[PDB]
Amino acid sequence: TLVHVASVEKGRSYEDFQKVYNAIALKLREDDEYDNYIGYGPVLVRLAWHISGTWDKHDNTGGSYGGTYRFKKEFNDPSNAGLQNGFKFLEPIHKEFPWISSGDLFSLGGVTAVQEMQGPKIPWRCGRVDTPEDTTPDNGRLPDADKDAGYVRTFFQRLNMNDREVVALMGAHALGKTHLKNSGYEGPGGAANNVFTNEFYLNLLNEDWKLEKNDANNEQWDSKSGYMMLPTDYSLIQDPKYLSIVKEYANDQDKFFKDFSKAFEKLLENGITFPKDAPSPFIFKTLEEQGL
Ligand code: HEM
Ligand SMILES: NCc1ccccc1
C-alpha cells in the first residue's frame, strides 16, 4: 500500500503560511489584466484542481501530495493546456518562500483565489512533500468535457466524490472561461466570472441554451446572452439526481458555499494521511480582513 503522510515544513506554523497566502493575494490584486481583465483567480483554481485530480483512490497514485505538476510529463499533459500561466504566476511566490513544497503552493494558490474572489473560506492543511519525477502520473487521468452525466459520475468516483460533491465542485465553472486554443471550447459561463457565486447553477436553469458546434468543431451549449456550457456542465441538468442538486444551489448560495468548501478541501487532500498530531486545518484571513 502507498501511503503519503503529511509532514509539516520544518519549523513552519500558521503565520508562515498566511504570509504565502498574502503574497499570492497581493499578486492576484496586481495582475489584473490577465485574460482580458479576468485576472489569475480562475486559472489558479483550475491548477489546484488539476494537480489534485490525477489521484486514483484504488492505489493512491497521483494526487496533490507529490507536487508532480512541476515535471514535464504532467505540465505538458494536453488536459493541462493553459495552466502554465498559473504556474508562472506562482514562480515568484515560490522564490520568495522557497521552504514551501510544490503541492502545498499549488493547492494554496487555489484556496487563496477562491477566498480573494469573495468565495467561502476553505480550510487548508500543510504538509505535502515533493516526490521524484518517476512518481508523476501518466496523462489521461483528467476528465473529458464532451461526455454525459454517466461519465461524470463514474469519473468522479475515482476521486471518491459523490453526487453532491460533483455538483458542488462543478460550480467553480462560474469562474473564468473556456479558451478554444486550450481545450477546443470557447466562452464564459456568465457575467460574474471573477467573483465566486452560485451563478453556474442559476445560468444552467435560467438561460435558453442552444446546442451548437464551435470553431473547433466541438458541440457546446450557447445562450443568446453570450454564455456557454460544456456538454459535461449541461449533463448536470439532464441527469435527474444532478438536476435536483443544481436547483438547491441555484436557490441557496450559502448551502453551495458550504458544500463547495468541504468538497474542495477534500479534493485537495485526497491521498494524504494527516497524523493525529498534525495541526488543525488553517483558515487564512483575506487581505481585506487584515487591512492589507
Ligand atoms: C467533469 C469535470 C470537468 C471538466 C470536464 C472540466 C472541463 C473544463 C474545461 C474544458 C475548461 C476550459 C479550459 C480552457 O479552455 O482554458 C475548464 C476550465 C475551468 N475549470 Fe473545469 N472541468 C471539470 C471540473 C472542474 C472542477 C472540479 C473544478 C474546480 C473545482 C474546475 C475548475 C475550473 C476553472 C476555475 C476553469 C476556468 C479556467 C480559466 O479561466 O483559465 N473544473 N474546465
Ligand atoms: N460553463 C462554461 C465554463 C466551463 C468551464 C469554465 C468556465 C466556464
CATH number of the domain enclosing 185: 1.10.420.10
Structural domain harbouring 30: 1-142+264-292
The verdict on the CB of residue 231 being under 6 Å from ligand 2 is no
Q: Which residue has the cell 514551501?
A: 100
Across the strands, what pairs with 201?
Answer: none
- Closest alpha carbon to 126 in 292, 284, 287: 284
Quick one: 135 and 115 in the same domain? yes
Quick one: 113 and 21 in the same domain? yes
Quick one: 46 and 122 in the same domain? yes
* Long-range contacts at 164-168 (CB < 8 A, ≥ 24 apart): 164/245, 164/259, 164/263, 165/259, 165/262, 165/263, 165/266, 166/242, 167/236, 167/242, 167/245, 167/246, 167/249, 168/245, 168/249, 168/256, 168/259, 168/260, 168/262, 168/263
Q: Cα–Cα–Cα angle for 120, 125, 126, nearest 5°?
A: 135
Write the single-letter amino acid at 249: Y
Q: Which of 46, 83, 155, 200 to mutate to test the pocket of ligand 1 (most atoms within 8 A of CB)?
A: 46
State CA 200 to chain mean position distance.
Answer: 15
Quick one: 240 and 99 in the same domain? no
| DSSP class per residue in the chain | ---EE--PPTT--HHHHHHHHHHHHHHHHH-TTHHHHT-SHHHHHHHHHHHHTT-BTTTTBSSSTT-GGGSHHHHT-GGGTTTHHHHHHHHHHHHH-TTS-HHHHHHHHHHHHHHHTT-----B--------GGGPPPS--SPPSS--HHHHHHHHHTTT--HHHHHHHHGGGGSSEE-HHHHS--EESSS--SS--SHHHHHHHHS-EEEEE-TTS-EEEEETTS-EE-HHHHHHHHSHHHHHHHHHHHH-HHHHHHHHHHHHHHHHHTTEE--TTSPPPB-PPPHHHHT-
In this structure, the residues whose C-beta lies within 6 A of any atom of ligand 1 are 42-43, 45-46, 49, 82, 143, 145, 152, 169-170, 172-173, 175-179, 182-183, 185, 230, 232, 264
| Atom from ligand 2 closest to the CA of residue 188 | 8
CA distances from 216 to 179, 199, 227 (A): 11, 26, 17
Burial of 224 (0-12, 13-18, 19+ CB in 10 A): exposed
Quick one: 179 and 252 in the same domain? yes
Ligand 1 centroid, distance to 46 Cα (angstroms):
6
Q: 233, 177 in Cβ contact below 8 A? A: no
Resolution in angstrom units: 1.5
Ligand lying closest to the C-alpha of residue 200: 2
What φ, ψ does residue 238 adopt, rounded to 5°?
Answer: -90, -40
Q: 167, 263 in Cβ contact below 8 A? A: no
Across the strands, what pairs with 177?
Answer: 188
Quick one: 39 and 60 in the same domain? yes
Elucidation method: X-ray
Give the chain's domain count.
2
Ligand 1 centroid, distance to 158 Cα (angstroms):
17
Burial of 22 (0-12, 13-18, 19+ CB in 10 A): middle
Quick one: 130 and 270 in the same domain? yes
Quick one: 194 and 152 in the same domain? yes
Q: Would you state the cell numbers that stand for residue 227, as one nine-digit string?
A: 454564455
Ligand 1 centroid, distance to 142 Cα (angstroms):
10
Q: Which residue has the cell 468538497?
A: 263
Ligand 1 centroid, distance to 107 Cα (angstroms):
15
Quick one: 274 and 231 in the same domain? no
Q: 122, 37 in Cβ contact below 8 A? A: no
Q: Which residue has the cell 500561466?
A: 85
Q: Would you state the cell numbers that stand for residue 271, as one nine-digit string?
A: 491521498
Q: 201, 246 in Cβ contact below 8 A? A: yes
